[PDB]
Write a protein that binds this ligand. Structure first.
Ligand SMILES: [K+]
Ligand SMILES: [K+]
Ligand SMILES: [K+]
Ligand SMILES: [K+]
Ligand SMILES: [K+]
Ligand SMILES: [K+]
Ligand SMILES: [K+]
Ligand SMILES: [K+]
Ligand SMILES: [K+]
Ligand SMILES: [K+]
Ligand SMILES: [K+]
Ligand SMILES: [K+]
Ligand SMILES: [K+]
Ligand SMILES: [Mg+2]
Ligand SMILES: [Mg+2]
Ligand SMILES: [Mg+2]
Ligand SMILES: [Mg+2]
Ligand SMILES: [Mg+2]
Ligand SMILES: [Mg+2]
Ligand SMILES: [Mg+2]
Lengths: 245, 55, 117, 233
RNA sequence: AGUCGAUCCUAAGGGUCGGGGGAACCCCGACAGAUAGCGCGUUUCGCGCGUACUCCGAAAGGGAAUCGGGUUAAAAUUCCU
RNA sequence: GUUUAACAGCCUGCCCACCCUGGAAACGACUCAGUCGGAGGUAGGGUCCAGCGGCUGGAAGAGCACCGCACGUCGCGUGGUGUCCGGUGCGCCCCCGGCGGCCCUUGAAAAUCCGGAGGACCGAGUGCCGUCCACGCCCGGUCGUACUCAUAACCGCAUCAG
RNA sequence: UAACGUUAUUUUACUUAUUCCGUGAAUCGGAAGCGGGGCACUGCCCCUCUUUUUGGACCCAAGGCUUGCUUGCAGGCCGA
């Protein structure tokens, strides 16, 4: 008869993201004439740590195309980039790690990261540490390109979408065991209030479908409907299968 | 405490280009880089002109 | 017309100052905080007399709305005496008290005798 | 003299900063401008029924100029002229024993009065503005003029029609009679207007309008057609 | 009390214009938009910049400036020198 | 008990950082720990940075201690002497400097202030144009300020072992 | 399995309704010019928009032509 924890997540106010010390969103430059037709040079000024994010971020300074001022940007750092390196963004940029190129100019089999979904969205795919996308094939007829996402899914995107050559830096982070609850506490302290987690069978019936009973047990199949209403949809949602491979 | 009415000018200034902002070594590096890059730009331009004349 | 800025800015248009046909208030209001309203009465406690004798300072109970500049002006108008500095505080009873120190050119004792304290 | 020299600027991607240019076509316009332009675009794109489409075919420039030159000499009297006439009549009322005055010949304006004159077969020429909003006020007028066999024309500018009759705008104007010295040229203009509008009413009753796409899509369609023709050639 | 604080700044956040909802009390909150204005010279007009909140939010965060000596029954880095 | 405030000037110059000469294996220098050097060490000579460092003015006239004369009811009176010289430290409180360890944790913003790139524009010959220099002149609003802060001044129905 | 007609399911075309994305709405569509290349002979065809050894700087036009009148300077075109 009580709202369950998963339901209470949506309202927020204690489950909102912790973003006080973050350095701002990481994204490409806004797509403009120079990047659409030629190339624009930038210089990496700093590689910084973004709290709550495994991948490091790189500060890049560009010369504004038509204003007398500096154009400052914050890119997701690709492995191998360094302070003082020159970064080239555009259709005519060379195929080197760190450069941002339109997918039409990236040959098949290349390794890219922070791939745009819509032309000009400034990067949504393959952004986490150690992740990358692979260019599969190009379709000149309809101006679309096929890529392989980190999850293994194959997606078709317009060939005008941009991507950064190389893989995201910071790879191999998750292979290290934490060994203790304190490390997880520190990890999630900067992400959101999602830890520790209480098992549903440890609760009373009033606050979870798994609650209750003189023994700890679910008492009914943990696989639930895709259309099950909130508060009832707990456990393995719309599972096509369960158990080991 | 750096306010002009409170601190003498000599105390808050360095008599050199970019004085008080860039160190001496950084200023020297900037000057050398500017000169050499301009020289290489001239060299590239003259090389391109010579190649165009040859062809 | 040639526009060099993509952003549109509202053009500057002429504005006119108010020229009312009638005044909303028929006549200017009276000056409530005049010199007589500012200075209620001198304080004649033992501490006030000690201040008068020692520090050449007069103690007055003053309107709570009066500021130090108004107190100085009111003292000058009422008694024709310069003031070196005015210190003010609000007593626990809710009234304002002012310590008015006269310049060396003026004697506090003579001023107090003239006032009648 | 030898101290003056050229300082050319290399303008390009990554080159010298460009000078001030015309950005008018990229301006983020206010809401009113955007809506008033998109309304015109939408009217162009959609198919216009013949009854509304007939208002896009206005009088020719030369014919319109001639008609308005003729109309300028039949304007209604202004306020000052009316006051002068009234005071003169009052002054000469008793002294002159009310002398007879010739009936004035002026253009007629006002939708009520014009419709009444058309229905009574008194109008000899009907001038209809092409930009009446809402257009339901005059969309039926050509049909009424045709049914009554009254020559009618559609001209550009309700503001101009209003200026004829000393008003901000006029939905339509009518002429019931013309002076003797102007009858032959009025007959010429009437014949021209009848041939242009009244005789083409039946054919225009079935002609739809609109359906015009944008210039970029038009160019794309033209390129596709050219490719197809070249392949078939 | 010009010198100690509030007062100023902004933090988590709060309150809002417009817009969008709402029978309405009200809800979201700069997100549907001709922003506030800011500099130069002046016949006070002209020129040039101008990305929709110049509001609230810390007597422990940031921050313009005071020290001895003396003095009251009771005040002091505030009164006297 | 034998004291020396803010502030002004001069001096000094920690640990670092920086500059000039020079060119190093038989490698050297070096910390409690590290570390550094042909991307220029050791060495010699310098620049800068901190100071809650030193001296002087403030300032002995003040404060403190001691020794006296006097009114002896009301002189908040009157005078003298001294305030000096060294040591010591894994000592305690505070501040600072420079290294090292830790992070799937990297540990605010703004007001405000300083500096810099550029050089449109700008002045004269016995006066003009500038001037963040020194000295001189005037002003500085409003509110809080007593007291307790607790085995009786707050809460716990109290002058309550909480 | 088509002349006529009814019915149902798919495929596909357009963009202005509608929905979504980006921007401080800053070069979008067509064509033509400056340059480079093939052909054969004077025209056709195919291409580009100037920036890639360096942790520098880059704005507020130089120049040419043309008017007011002879310039305190000011007004136009190219440069763009
Ligand atoms: K419930
Ligand atoms: K938690
Ligand atoms: K658990
Ligand atoms: K259960
Ligand atoms: K169980
Ligand atoms: K509403
Ligand atoms: K809002
Ligand atoms: K504060
Ligand atoms: K004092
Ligand atoms: K001080
Ligand atoms: K400067
Ligand atoms: K006090
Ligand atoms: K207290
Ligand atoms: Mg169990
Ligand atoms: Mg605006
Ligand atoms: Mg509203
Ligand atoms: Mg403010
Ligand atoms: Mg002494
Ligand atoms: Mg300068
Ligand atoms: Mg109570």
């Amino acid at each position: 008869g009580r709202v369950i924890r998963a339901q209470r997540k949506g309202a927020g106010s204690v489950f909102k993201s912790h973003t006080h010390h973050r350095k701002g969103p990481a994204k490409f430059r806004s797509l403009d004439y120079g990047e659409r037709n030629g190339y624009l040079k930038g210089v990496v000024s700093e590689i910084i740590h973004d709290p709550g994010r495994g991948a490091p971020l790189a500060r890049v300074t560009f010369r504004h195309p038509f204003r007398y001022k500096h154009q400052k940007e914050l890119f997701v750092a690709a492995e191998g980039m360094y302070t003082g390196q020159f970064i080239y963004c555009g259709k005519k940029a060379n195929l080197m790690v760190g450069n941002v190129l339109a997918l039409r100019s990236i040959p098949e089999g290349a390794v890219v990261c922070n791939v745009e979904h819509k032309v000009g969205d400034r990067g949504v795919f393959a952004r986490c540490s150690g992740d990358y996308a692979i260019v599969i094939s190009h379709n000149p007829d309809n101006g679309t390109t096929r890529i392989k996402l980190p999850s293994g899914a194959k997606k078709i995107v317009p060939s005008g979408c941009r991507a950064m050559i190389g893989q995201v830096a910071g790879g191999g982070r998750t292979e290290k065991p934490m060994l203790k609850a304190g490390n997880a506490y520190h990890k999630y302290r900067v992400k959101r209030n999602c830890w520790p987690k209480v098992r549903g069978v440890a609760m009373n019936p009033v606050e979870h479908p798994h609650g209750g009973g003189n023994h700890q047990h679910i008492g009914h199949a943990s696989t639930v409907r895709r259309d099950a209403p909130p508060g009832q949809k707990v456990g393995l949602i719309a599972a096509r299968r369960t158990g080991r491979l | 405490e750096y306010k002009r009415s409170r601190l003498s000018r000599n105390r808050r200034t360095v008599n050199r280009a970019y004085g008080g902002v860039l160190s001496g070594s950084a200023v020297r590096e900037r000057i050398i880089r500017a000169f050499l890059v301009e020289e290489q730009k001239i060299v590239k331009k003259v090389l391109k002109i010579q190649k165009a004349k040859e062809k | 017309k040639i526009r060099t800025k993509v952003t549109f800015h509202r053009p500057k248009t002429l504005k006119k100052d108010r020229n009312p046909k009638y005044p909303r208030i028929s006549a200017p209001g009276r000056n409530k905080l005049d010199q007589y309203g500012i200075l209620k009465y001198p304080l004649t406690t033992e501490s006030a007399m000690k201040k008068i004798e020692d520090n050449n300072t007069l103690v007055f109970i003053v309107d709570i709305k009066a500021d130090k500049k108004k107190i100085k002006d009111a003292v000058k108008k009422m008694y024709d005496i310069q003031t070196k500095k005015v210190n003010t505080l609000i007593r626990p009873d809710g009234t304002k008290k002012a310590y008015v120190r006269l310049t060396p050119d003026y004697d506090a004792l003579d001023v107090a005798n003239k006032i009648g304290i | 003299n030898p101290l003056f020299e050229k300082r050319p600027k290399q303008f390009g991607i990554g080159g010298a900063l460009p000078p001030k240019k015309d950005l008018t076509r990229f301006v983020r316009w206010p809401q009113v401008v955007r809506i008033q332009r998109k309304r015109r675009i939408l009217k162009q794109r959609l198919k216009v029924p013949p009854s509304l489409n007939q208002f896009s075919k206005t009088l020719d420039k030369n014919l319109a100029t001639n008609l308005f030159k003729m109309l300028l000499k039949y304007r209604p009297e202004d306020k000052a002229a009316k006051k002068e006439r009234l005071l003169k009549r009052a002054q000469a009322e008793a002294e002159g024993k009310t002398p007879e005055t010739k009936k004035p010949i002026i253009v007629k304006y006002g939708l009520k009065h014009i419709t009444y004159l058309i229905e009574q077969n008194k109008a000899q020429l009907v001038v209809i503005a092409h930009d009446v909003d809402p257009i339901e006020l005059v969309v039926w007028l050509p049909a009424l003029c045709r049914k009554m066999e009254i020559p009618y024309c559609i001209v550009k500018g309700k503001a101009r029609l209003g200026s004829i009759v000393h008003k901000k705008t006029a939905s339509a104007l009518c002429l019931t009679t013309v002076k003797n010295e102007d009858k032959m040229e009025f007959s010429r203009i009437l014949e021209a207007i009848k041939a242009n509008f009244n005789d083409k009413y039946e054919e225009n009753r079935k002609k739809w309008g609109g359906g015009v796409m944008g210039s970029k899509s038009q160019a794309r369609t033209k390129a596709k057609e050219r490719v197809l023709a070249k392949e078939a050639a």
